[PDB]
Design a protein around this ligand. Sequence first.
Ligand SMILES: [Mg+2]
Ligand SMILES: [Mg+2]
Ligand SMILES: [Mg+2]
Ligand SMILES: [Mg+2]
Ligand SMILES: [Mg+2]
Ligand SMILES: [Mg+2]
Ligand SMILES: [Mg+2]
Ligand SMILES: [Mg+2]
Ligand SMILES: [Mg+2]
Ligand SMILES: [Mg+2]
Ligand SMILES: [Mg+2]
Ligand SMILES: [Mg+2]
Ligand SMILES: [Mg+2]
Ligand SMILES: [Mg+2]
Ligand SMILES: [Mg+2]
Ligand SMILES: [Mg+2]
Ligand SMILES: [Mg+2]
Ligand SMILES: [Mg+2]
Ligand SMILES: [Mg+2]
Ligand SMILES: [Mg+2]
Ligand SMILES: [Mg+2]
Ligand SMILES: [Mg+2]
Ligand SMILES: [Mg+2]
Ligand SMILES: [Mg+2]
Ligand SMILES: [Mg+2]
Ligand SMILES: [Mg+2]
Ligand SMILES: [Mg+2]
Ligand SMILES: [Mg+2]
Ligand SMILES: [Mg+2]
Ligand SMILES: [Mg+2]
Ligand SMILES: [Mg+2]
Ligand SMILES: [Mg+2]
Ligand SMILES: [Mg+2]
Ligand SMILES: [Mg+2]
Ligand SMILES: [Mg+2]
Ligand SMILES: [Mg+2]
Ligand SMILES: [Mg+2]
Ligand SMILES: [Mg+2]
Ligand SMILES: [Mg+2]
Ligand SMILES: [Mg+2]
Ligand SMILES: [Mg+2]
Ligand SMILES: [Mg+2]
Ligand SMILES: [Mg+2]
Ligand SMILES: [Mg+2]
Ligand SMILES: [Mg+2]
Ligand SMILES: [Mg+2]
Ligand SMILES: [Mg+2]
Ligand SMILES: [Mg+2]
Ligand SMILES: [Mg+2]
Ligand SMILES: [Mg+2]
Ligand SMILES: [Mg+2]
Ligand SMILES: [Mg+2]
Ligand SMILES: [Mg+2]
Ligand SMILES: [Mg+2]
Ligand SMILES: [Mg+2]
Ligand SMILES: [Mg+2]
Ligand SMILES: [Mg+2]
Ligand SMILES: [Mg+2]
Ligand SMILES: [Mg+2]
Ligand SMILES: [Mg+2]
Ligand SMILES: [Mg+2]
Ligand SMILES: [Mg+2]
Ligand SMILES: [Mg+2]
Ligand SMILES: [Mg+2]
Ligand SMILES: [Mg+2]
Ligand SMILES: [Mg+2]
Ligand SMILES: [Mg+2]
Ligand SMILES: [Mg+2]
Ligand SMILES: [Mg+2]
Ligand SMILES: [Mg+2]
Ligand SMILES: [Mg+2]
Ligand SMILES: [Mg+2]
Ligand SMILES: [Mg+2]
Ligand SMILES: [Mg+2]
Ligand SMILES: [Mg+2]
Ligand SMILES: [Mg+2]
Ligand SMILES: [Mg+2]
Ligand SMILES: [Mg+2]
Ligand SMILES: [Mg+2]
Ligand SMILES: [Mg+2]
Ligand SMILES: [Mg+2]
Ligand SMILES: [Mg+2]
Ligand SMILES: [Mg+2]
Ligand SMILES: [Mg+2]
Ligand SMILES: [Mg+2]
Ligand SMILES: [Mg+2]
Ligand SMILES: [Mg+2]
Ligand SMILES: [Mg+2]
Ligand SMILES: [Mg+2]
Ligand SMILES: [Mg+2]
Ligand SMILES: [Mg+2]
Ligand SMILES: [Mg+2]
Ligand SMILES: [Mg+2]
Ligand SMILES: [Mg+2]
Ligand SMILES: [Mg+2]
Ligand SMILES: [Mg+2]
Ligand SMILES: [Mg+2]
Ligand SMILES: [Mg+2]
Ligand SMILES: [Mg+2]
Ligand SMILES: [Mg+2]
Ligand SMILES: [Mg+2]
Ligand SMILES: [Mg+2]
Ligand SMILES: [Mg+2]
Ligand SMILES: [Mg+2]
Ligand SMILES: [Mg+2]
Ligand SMILES: [Mg+2]
Ligand SMILES: [Mg+2]
Ligand SMILES: [Mg+2]
Ligand SMILES: [Mg+2]
Ligand SMILES: [Mg+2]
Ligand SMILES: [Mg+2]
Ligand SMILES: [Mg+2]
Ligand SMILES: [Mg+2]
Ligand SMILES: [Mg+2]
Ligand SMILES: [Mg+2]
Ligand SMILES: [Mg+2]
Ligand SMILES: [Mg+2]
Ligand SMILES: [Mg+2]
Ligand SMILES: [Mg+2]
Ligand SMILES: [Mg+2]
Ligand SMILES: [Mg+2]
Ligand SMILES: [Mg+2]
Ligand SMILES: [Mg+2]
Ligand SMILES: [Mg+2]
Ligand SMILES: [Mg+2]
Ligand SMILES: [Mg+2]
Ligand SMILES: [Mg+2]
Ligand SMILES: [Mg+2]
Ligand SMILES: [Mg+2]
Ligand SMILES: [Mg+2]
Ligand SMILES: [Mg+2]
Ligand SMILES: [Mg+2]
Ligand SMILES: [Mg+2]
Ligand SMILES: [Mg+2]
Ligand SMILES: [Mg+2]
Ligand SMILES: [Mg+2]
Ligand SMILES: [Mg+2]
Ligand SMILES: [Mg+2]
Ligand SMILES: [Mg+2]
Ligand SMILES: [Mg+2]
Ligand SMILES: [Mg+2]
Ligand SMILES: [Mg+2]
Ligand SMILES: [Mg+2]
Ligand SMILES: [Mg+2]
Ligand SMILES: [Mg+2]
Ligand SMILES: [Mg+2]
Ligand SMILES: [Mg+2]
Ligand SMILES: [Mg+2]
Ligand SMILES: [Mg+2]
Ligand SMILES: [Mg+2]
Ligand SMILES: [Mg+2]
Ligand SMILES: [Mg+2]
Ligand SMILES: [Mg+2]
Ligand SMILES: [Mg+2]
Ligand SMILES: [Mg+2]
Ligand SMILES: [Mg+2]
Ligand SMILES: [Mg+2]
Ligand SMILES: [Mg+2]
Ligand SMILES: [Mg+2]
Ligand SMILES: [Mg+2]
Ligand SMILES: [Mg+2]
Lengths: 47, 271
Amino acid sequence: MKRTWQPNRRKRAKTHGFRARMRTPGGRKVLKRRRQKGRWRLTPAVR
Amino acid sequence: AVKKFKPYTPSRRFMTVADFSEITKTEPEKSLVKPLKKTGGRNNQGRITVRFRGGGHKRLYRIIDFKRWDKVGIPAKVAAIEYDPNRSARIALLHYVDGEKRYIIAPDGLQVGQQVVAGPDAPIQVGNALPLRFIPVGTVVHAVELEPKKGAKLARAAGTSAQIQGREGDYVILRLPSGELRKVHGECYATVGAVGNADHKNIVLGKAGRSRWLGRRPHVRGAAMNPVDHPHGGGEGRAPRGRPPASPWGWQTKGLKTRKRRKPSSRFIIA
RNA sequence: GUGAAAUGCGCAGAUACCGGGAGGAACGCCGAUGGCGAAGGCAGCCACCUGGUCCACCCGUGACGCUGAGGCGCGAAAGCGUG
RNA sequence: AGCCUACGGGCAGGCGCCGAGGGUAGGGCCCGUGACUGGGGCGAAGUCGUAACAAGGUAGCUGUACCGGAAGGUGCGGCUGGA
RNA sequence: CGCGGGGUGGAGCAGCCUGGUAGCUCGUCGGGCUCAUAACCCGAAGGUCGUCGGUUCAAAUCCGGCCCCCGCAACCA
RNA sequence: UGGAGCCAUGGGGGAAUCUGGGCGGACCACCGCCUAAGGCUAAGUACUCCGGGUGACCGAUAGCGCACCAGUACCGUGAGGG
RNA sequence: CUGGCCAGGGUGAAGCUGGGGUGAGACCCAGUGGAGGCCCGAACCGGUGGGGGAUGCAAACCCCUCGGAUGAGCUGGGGCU
RNA sequence: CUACGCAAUGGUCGUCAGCGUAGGGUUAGGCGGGACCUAAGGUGAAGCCGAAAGGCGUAGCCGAAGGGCAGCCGGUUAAUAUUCCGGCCCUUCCCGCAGGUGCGAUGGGGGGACGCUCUAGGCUAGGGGGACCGGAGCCAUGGACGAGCCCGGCCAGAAGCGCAGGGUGGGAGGUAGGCAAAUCCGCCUCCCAACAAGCUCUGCGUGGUGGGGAAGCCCGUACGGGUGACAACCCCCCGAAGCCAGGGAGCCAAGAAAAGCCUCUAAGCACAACCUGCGGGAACCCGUACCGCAAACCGACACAGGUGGGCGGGUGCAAGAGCACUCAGGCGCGCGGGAGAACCCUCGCCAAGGAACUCUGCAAGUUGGCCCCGUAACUUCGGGAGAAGGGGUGCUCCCUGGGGUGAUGAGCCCCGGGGAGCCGCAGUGAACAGGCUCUGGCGACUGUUUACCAAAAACACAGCUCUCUGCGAACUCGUAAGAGGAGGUAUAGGGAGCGACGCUUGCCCGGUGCCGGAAGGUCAAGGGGAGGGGUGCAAGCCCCGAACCGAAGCCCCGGUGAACGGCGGCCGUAACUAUAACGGUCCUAAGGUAGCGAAAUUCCUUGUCGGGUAAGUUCCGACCUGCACGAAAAGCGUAACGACCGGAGCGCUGUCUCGGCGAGGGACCCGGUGAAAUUGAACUGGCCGUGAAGAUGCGGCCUACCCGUGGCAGGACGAAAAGACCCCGUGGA
RNA sequence: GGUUUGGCACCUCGAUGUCGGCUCGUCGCAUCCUGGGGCUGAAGAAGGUCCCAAGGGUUGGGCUGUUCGCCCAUUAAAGCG
Ligand SMILES: [Mg+2]
Ligand SMILES: [Mg+2]
Ligand SMILES: [Mg+2]
Ligand SMILES: [Mg+2]
Ligand SMILES: [Mg+2]
Ligand SMILES: [Mg+2]
Ligand SMILES: [Mg+2]
Ligand SMILES: [Mg+2]
Ligand SMILES: [Mg+2]
Ligand SMILES: [Mg+2]
Ligand SMILES: [Mg+2]
Ligand SMILES: [Mg+2]
Ligand SMILES: [Mg+2]
Ligand SMILES: [Mg+2]
Ligand SMILES: [Mg+2]
Ligand SMILES: [Mg+2]
Ligand SMILES: [Mg+2]
Ligand SMILES: [Mg+2]
Ligand SMILES: [Mg+2]
Ligand SMILES: [Mg+2]
Ligand SMILES: [Mg+2]
Ligand SMILES: [Mg+2]
Ligand SMILES: [Mg+2]
Ligand SMILES: [Mg+2]
Ligand SMILES: [Mg+2]
Ligand SMILES: [Mg+2]
Ligand SMILES: [Mg+2]
Ligand SMILES: [Mg+2]
Ligand SMILES: [Mg+2]
Ligand SMILES: [Mg+2]
Ligand SMILES: [Mg+2]
Ligand SMILES: [Mg+2]
Ligand SMILES: [Mg+2]
Ligand SMILES: [Mg+2]
Ligand SMILES: [Mg+2]
Ligand SMILES: [Mg+2]
Ligand SMILES: [Mg+2]
Ligand SMILES: [Mg+2]
Ligand SMILES: [Mg+2]
Ligand SMILES: [Mg+2]
Ligand SMILES: [Mg+2]
Ligand SMILES: [Mg+2]
Ligand SMILES: [Mg+2]
Ligand SMILES: [Mg+2]
Ligand SMILES: [Mg+2]
Ligand SMILES: [Mg+2]
Ligand SMILES: [Mg+2]
Ligand SMILES: [Mg+2]
Ligand SMILES: [Mg+2]
Ligand SMILES: [Mg+2]
Ligand SMILES: [Mg+2]
Ligand SMILES: [Mg+2]
Ligand SMILES: [Mg+2]
Ligand SMILES: [Mg+2]
Ligand SMILES: [Mg+2]
Ligand SMILES: [Mg+2]
Ligand SMILES: [Mg+2]
Ligand SMILES: [Mg+2]
Ligand SMILES: [Mg+2]
Ligand SMILES: [Mg+2]
Ligand SMILES: [Mg+2]
Ligand SMILES: [Mg+2]
Ligand SMILES: [Mg+2]
Ligand SMILES: [Mg+2]
Ligand SMILES: [Mg+2]
Ligand SMILES: [Mg+2]
Ligand SMILES: [Mg+2]
Ligand SMILES: [Mg+2]
Ligand SMILES: [Mg+2]
Ligand SMILES: [Mg+2]
Ligand SMILES: [Mg+2]
Ligand SMILES: [Mg+2]
Ligand SMILES: [Mg+2]
Ligand SMILES: [Mg+2]
Ligand SMILES: [Mg+2]
Ligand SMILES: [Mg+2]
Ligand SMILES: [Mg+2]
Ligand SMILES: [Mg+2]
Ligand SMILES: [Mg+2]
Ligand SMILES: [Mg+2]
Ligand SMILES: [Mg+2]
Ligand SMILES: [Mg+2]
Ligand SMILES: [Mg+2]
Ligand SMILES: [Mg+2]
Ligand SMILES: [Mg+2]
Ligand SMILES: [Mg+2]
Ligand SMILES: [Mg+2]
Ligand SMILES: [Mg+2]
Ligand SMILES: [Mg+2]
Ligand SMILES: [Mg+2]
Ligand SMILES: [Mg+2]
Ligand SMILES: [Mg+2]
Ligand SMILES: [Mg+2]
Ligand SMILES: [Mg+2]
Ligand SMILES: [Mg+2]
Ligand SMILES: [Mg+2]
Ligand SMILES: [Mg+2]
Ligand SMILES: [Mg+2]
Ligand SMILES: [Mg+2]
Ligand SMILES: [Mg+2]
Ligand SMILES: [Mg+2]
Ligand SMILES: [Mg+2]
Ligand SMILES: [Mg+2]
Ligand SMILES: [Mg+2]
Ligand SMILES: [Mg+2]
Ligand SMILES: [Mg+2]
Ligand SMILES: [Mg+2]
Ligand SMILES: [Mg+2]
Ligand SMILES: [Mg+2]
Ligand SMILES: [Mg+2]
Ligand SMILES: [Mg+2]
Ligand SMILES: [Mg+2]
Ligand SMILES: [Mg+2]
Ligand SMILES: [Mg+2]
Ligand SMILES: [Mg+2]
Ligand SMILES: [Mg+2]
Ligand SMILES: [Mg+2]
Ligand SMILES: [Mg+2]
Ligand SMILES: [Mg+2]
Ligand SMILES: [Mg+2]
Ligand SMILES: [Mg+2]
Ligand SMILES: [Mg+2]
Ligand SMILES: [Mg+2]
Ligand SMILES: [Mg+2]
Ligand SMILES: [Mg+2]
Ligand SMILES: [Mg+2]
Ligand SMILES: [Mg+2]
Ligand SMILES: [Mg+2]
Ligand SMILES: [Mg+2]
Ligand SMILES: [Mg+2]
Ligand SMILES: [Mg+2]
Ligand SMILES: [Mg+2]
Ligand SMILES: [Mg+2]
Ligand SMILES: [Mg+2]
Ligand SMILES: [Mg+2]
Ligand SMILES: [Mg+2]
Ligand SMILES: [Mg+2]
Ligand SMILES: [Mg+2]
Ligand SMILES: [Mg+2]
Ligand SMILES: [Mg+2]
Ligand SMILES: [Mg+2]
Ligand SMILES: [Mg+2]
Ligand SMILES: [Mg+2]
Ligand SMILES: [Mg+2]
Ligand SMILES: [Mg+2]
Ligand SMILES: [Mg+2]
Ligand SMILES: [Mg+2]
Ligand SMILES: [Mg+2]
Ligand SMILES: [Mg+2]
Ligand SMILES: [Mg+2]
Ligand SMILES: [Mg+2]
Ligand SMILES: [Mg+2]
Ligand SMILES: [Mg+2]
Ligand SMILES: [Mg+2]
Ligand SMILES: [Mg+2]
Ligand SMILES: [Mg+2]
Ligand SMILES: [Mg+2]
Ligand SMILES: [Mg+2]
Ligand SMILES: [Mg+2]
Ligand SMILES: [Mg+2]
Ligand SMILES: [Mg+2]
């Protein structure tokens, strides 16, 4: 039956995207954690 | 009159509709004034703040003139009476000689071709508007203002109307639709006559939808919910409140008066 | 308030009196063994729409009349439905 | 395919329509009977009150309406077959 | 059977806790009023206080034992 | 909350300029301390991404999660896990 | 907020039109018409009963059967809590 | 896509591949996005709010499967094509020339611009015929040289033409309005014109002309290449849900915005400028492979699941996107080969019986389409109705009535009516395809729900009542600003209960709640200070502190039931007996009315009678000592409706007496690949008995050669899950 | 005796599935039939009661989830554990 994951590029960018992370102070901190941790992607990879 | 239906289907055995002869000559609104994109949505910034709203036929908003002192002395011919999805009452589209057109909440009796105007001078005949003070005590009027120059706010629902009881200073005494006796400023405008389409109270929606077409979602009873949801909720197998009728929010709902006690707005009421 | 009482109302200021206001129903005297209507029934005053009926003149039609199963309408009060 | 023929034809025979009646199904009218139940009639003994007839001790009566152990009471209008 | 209320003239209730006093309405008996019965009026009689014991100077009354009456509760498998 | 002063102050009231005014644990009186409602000021102190030096520190299931192309593979929508 | 979708049948409301009827009416006939959380039934939505499956094809599935199917209908995309 | 490959990936194999290595491959002014518009919403100048972070928010800006905008038919590649090429046809910008005109906005107006259902007239897409046109060929196996059989008879196309439609009155005056600036809109007044014409804008046909063009045969790995003919390219018929489109009619629930685009004028500028022509130039950025109901997407997998839009041919069947077969096209599901056990699944048939099965006809059967007769109680007159129950149904020939298109006549399609007759067991001959009835309970009804054990009598529902709310409404969200309510205004909005409709909905304001009461009682801070204290030589500075004045709340007084709620006990009494209309007494705030009643409620209980059965703890009808109905947590009914729960019949059955046979997929044998939970170790028998009281493992006795394979499930207190019950914990929620 | 209702709380709560039916049984005898037998208030036929003896038998339905009962129709009997 219909599962949870229903891929949608626009949806993903708008939601977890870098620009989005940057607006909210919470999102900013995400980036801060990820960078400080040394992640190779601060944001979900999408094209 | 209210149209009735032979029961060729249940729900349509009780369903009754309005008598649309009144409106006639004009179905499509005035692309001029009227045309105003109306916003739907049953709630504010996020959360819903009025339960059970939503759905219901698309709806365009007719922009009516609730303050007639705009064009004092300038008369207008009642061009037509048309349907309006945003209110119980019907509306009358009128062309002023001025050339300008507006929408007035169509009073009972008013007819096409008939002429109307608003001002102190104005003749006391159904359709004209004048500051209450210049209106014969006793006559019935609708679309009344509460405070001068603030717009009509009283008696506008289909078939409603207020009556002038008497004067007393710069104030005139009105008996509002609810039966309340309130002192209203003499300068407040009011248009002579009663609202109209008074058969409105006589329509029987008929089915469960219809109620839906009017954008009214189903209303679920308290006792039917669970303790978390409502004070009446809970209890094994059907039950009686548990004392004393309350709302989902905790306040009593059978009798408890609610208007602000110390509101200055009193000292002007008596009913 | 009654036969007499009590219930009840009233010192939170009633009853009794004056002034103002709201509202609903009914129309005192005239008024009668009176009038009108087919019956039920109809009473302040004003206007509008309207039925019946009586008198006078012998003008006109020329038996065109009477009753009336059924049908149709009206029909006190109480009662019923929507407001 | 039979039998007779005066070789046209007739007869037996075969097929079909109709058909007494039998069958299935669903209706109409009438009769009988049924746990229990409604009201009725008559009662030489019971229980309860007293509604009505004399202002019958609240004039009676009446259509209707609500109520009451019961008769009945009360409201609305009506009658006189009461004053 | 486990908690608790209850048996008082013929009927129905007081009196018991704050032990020495049996009260109330009805009924029953006597007498009036009426022609007579009710109704009304006047006057009386009637109670082992369920039962056997216990405390006390004295027990309907306070304490226990069964005898009956009424009301709760008899849950989770 | 105590006998509750001292320091700060949201509300109300509301002075004085050295005969001024605060404090010395309620409050008075003595005796004494100090000058509120403007501001700045090294050093001694803290920490360790980074560089170096040591180690009765580990020695590839230990030591950092990672000695190795590891915050990777992979998992999760995601934060995150790893 | 903005788009899309719903085979084919069936029943035959109101209105009209004509006739009848009456003082006028109400009303009554046909014909026309094509209403409805109407009927049967695909797509589409659903999940009634039974069987199967139970280290499954499947962390809810398959077959048969069944409900809705112009509506309080189903559905894509864009949003909000 | 291609060339090399096969370790691994592929549930087997593998030379193959969606796999490995490598090289190619995606071409646009017109297709889709962006150098256009606005929707919800987001963001956000001003502005408001907030301890910080941050929350609001007019304009503006962003934001699209919506609006707007110029490409059709063919040809080529191993792999792209409305993109390259060919033919035909367009769009913007810039410049120049000519001819026109008050040109000119971010502003004004118009327009864009709109629902649902049903629909007219024309077309087109698409499809079926043809004696006609063009074709290679073919007469087999008894017959046919035949109007034979077989294959194909189109596409695109500017101007101009026609055929259908769509939009729209033309004038001249005034003018308080369009936040007047207007020659434009808008209103008035009056010559003209009118179920039009004219002017425009679409669609369709035609059009110079340009493409395409089979079956079969020959070559051929692949993919296709000549063939093919100078191919023909015509006539009828059916015909859209698509086009003309902004068409028409009806209806109530009353159906986006903005730009492009017309037009009006403002500043400005008129040697500007726009407008129409005609030339010559200029025209960017991103996407374009391939998969795309699936082995390439979401499901850990090449997973029987899930995934939006369009096309989706033919014959037949009443119709159809249904069903059966079938084109084009695509597939045979990435383990096979044998056997012919039990048993399992899915499937077919069955003597006699026909529910006896069983909790239950669960399951399966029966019935099934269409046409025609013909249909009951009851009813809210719609319905119940497909009630029931019957008959017809194929093929052949004769006769005959209407329609559409043609032309009134011919073929071609579309509905019919009447006669004769033929063959089978059977004519909706296969596939799709209701079993029916009677009678109860609940709920009025369509609808909604526990995604994944409940679809219901639960929720919702129209409708009824109560109650709050006079508008900066009440109420909800928020610290606030603000927002919803509502651009609504008591015929409205919130809250509550009941739950279509019919007939109704009694009595009790003692207690609780809410409503009303300018008096009293009590009552905090604060006001007030009689009077008292600590200190000082003191003036003083400090403390406590009674009277009395002091809100709401509570007390108190009164109301209120579709407010929370409640609605009696014991004795006696009437011709046999029963029973008690009546009476007595205690108590209460008042003692349950109508109507129902062993009920979705009745313990005793399978109550007692009736009914239905041969037999009936259920069911239906009654009675009423209702453990423990009862009026809006409604009461009693009710046509219709229901995959709801009960009881009966008829029909028919493998449910059953009672089982038998047959089929296919497994099971079994061979070849290939090859798991799992579980597992103290094992050399793991029966009976009595013993033992922590249920022993393969102790005792005694008995039985027993070693090892497997197909089967069955009594035991290993078999597996699984640190029992969901129970108690415990001074555990949790 | 160990089939009822219990009492006790000994193994089992890191699980010993708890009524009824169906299927398949097997055993006990305190025997329901059938076979032997003694008394009898046993004339006969039919019974009563006790003794021996399970070898084999020990029906089909209505009702209820029922076990059990009651009932219909039979039977040699419609046994209890
Ligand atoms: Mg996943
Ligand atoms: Mg997207
Ligand atoms: Mg890197
Ligand atoms: Mg917002
Ligand atoms: Mg509700
Ligand atoms: Mg619930
Ligand atoms: Mg509450
Ligand atoms: Mg609560
Ligand atoms: Mg209950
Ligand atoms: Mg409750
Ligand atoms: Mg007169
Ligand atoms: Mg004459
Ligand atoms: Mg009358
Ligand atoms: Mg009356
Ligand atoms: Mg009444
Ligand atoms: Mg009335
Ligand atoms: Mg016959
Ligand atoms: Mg009878
Ligand atoms: Mg009798
Ligand atoms: Mg009397
Ligand atoms: Mg009398
Ligand atoms: Mg009397
Ligand atoms: Mg009367
Ligand atoms: Mg009375
Ligand atoms: Mg009277
Ligand atoms: Mg006594
Ligand atoms: Mg006496
Ligand atoms: Mg006497
Ligand atoms: Mg419990
Ligand atoms: Mg301060
Ligand atoms: Mg201060
Ligand atoms: Mg100085
Ligand atoms: Mg200080
Ligand atoms: Mg100080
Ligand atoms: Mg000090
Ligand atoms: Mg100090
Ligand atoms: Mg100091
Ligand atoms: Mg300083
Ligand atoms: Mg300083
Ligand atoms: Mg500093
Ligand atoms: Mg510093
Ligand atoms: Mg350091
Ligand atoms: Mg390590
Ligand atoms: Mg090592
Ligand atoms: Mg993942
Ligand atoms: Mg990932
Ligand atoms: Mg009609
Ligand atoms: Mg329907
Ligand atoms: Mg259907
Ligand atoms: Mg489709
Ligand atoms: Mg779906
Ligand atoms: Mg669902
Ligand atoms: Mg499905
Ligand atoms: Mg299912
Ligand atoms: Mg289910
Ligand atoms: Mg299943
Ligand atoms: Mg199953
Ligand atoms: Mg199984
Ligand atoms: Mg079906
Ligand atoms: Mg279906
Ligand atoms: Mg959607
Ligand atoms: Mg989305
Ligand atoms: Mg190769
Ligand atoms: Mg392999
Ligand atoms: Mg490759
Ligand atoms: Mg650029
Ligand atoms: Mg843009
Ligand atoms: Mg924009
Ligand atoms: Mg916006
Ligand atoms: Mg914001
Ligand atoms: Mg904005
Ligand atoms: Mg777009
Ligand atoms: Mg577009
Ligand atoms: Mg390709
Ligand atoms: Mg080209
Ligand atoms: Mg111009
Ligand atoms: Mg506009
Ligand atoms: Mg031959
Ligand atoms: Mg053809
Ligand atoms: Mg052409
Ligand atoms: Mg059409
Ligand atoms: Mg714009
Ligand atoms: Mg492609
Ligand atoms: Mg699929
Ligand atoms: Mg598809
Ligand atoms: Mg596969
Ligand atoms: Mg798949
Ligand atoms: Mg789909
Ligand atoms: Mg067809
Ligand atoms: Mg068909
Ligand atoms: Mg099919
Ligand atoms: Mg093929
Ligand atoms: Mg058989
Ligand atoms: Mg047979
Ligand atoms: Mg049979
Ligand atoms: Mg049976
Ligand atoms: Mg049985
Ligand atoms: Mg079945
Ligand atoms: Mg039915
Ligand atoms: Mg044939
Ligand atoms: Mg045609
Ligand atoms: Mg069929
Ligand atoms: Mg059918
Ligand atoms: Mg029942
Ligand atoms: Mg329902
Ligand atoms: Mg579920
Ligand atoms: Mg259902
Ligand atoms: Mg109702
Ligand atoms: Mg606040
Ligand atoms: Mg609004
Ligand atoms: Mg409401
Ligand atoms: Mg309301
Ligand atoms: Mg309810
Ligand atoms: Mg009563
Ligand atoms: Mg009260
Ligand atoms: Mg009360
Ligand atoms: Mg009271
Ligand atoms: Mg109060
Ligand atoms: Mg004080
Ligand atoms: Mg002193
Ligand atoms: Mg007070
Ligand atoms: Mg006696
Ligand atoms: Mg006697
Ligand atoms: Mg007697
Ligand atoms: Mg009761
Ligand atoms: Mg009763
Ligand atoms: Mg019974
Ligand atoms: Mg009960
Ligand atoms: Mg019972
Ligand atoms: Mg029972
Ligand atoms: Mg019987
Ligand atoms: Mg039976
Ligand atoms: Mg019986
Ligand atoms: Mg049965
Ligand atoms: Mg019954
Ligand atoms: Mg109840
Ligand atoms: Mg009540
Ligand atoms: Mg109630
Ligand atoms: Mg109900
Ligand atoms: Mg009922
Ligand atoms: Mg349903
Ligand atoms: Mg159902
Ligand atoms: Mg049934
Ligand atoms: Mg087989
Ligand atoms: Mg093998
Ligand atoms: Mg043992
Ligand atoms: Mg050993
Ligand atoms: Mg042993
Ligand atoms: Mg074995
Ligand atoms: Mg097995
Ligand atoms: Mg086992
Ligand atoms: Mg186990
Ligand atoms: Mg445990
Ligand atoms: Mg919690
Ligand atoms: Mg035992
Ligand atoms: Mg035991
Ligand atoms: Mg012990
Ligand atoms: Mg256990
Ligand atoms: Mg274990
Ligand atoms: Mg023996
Ligand atoms: Mg013998």
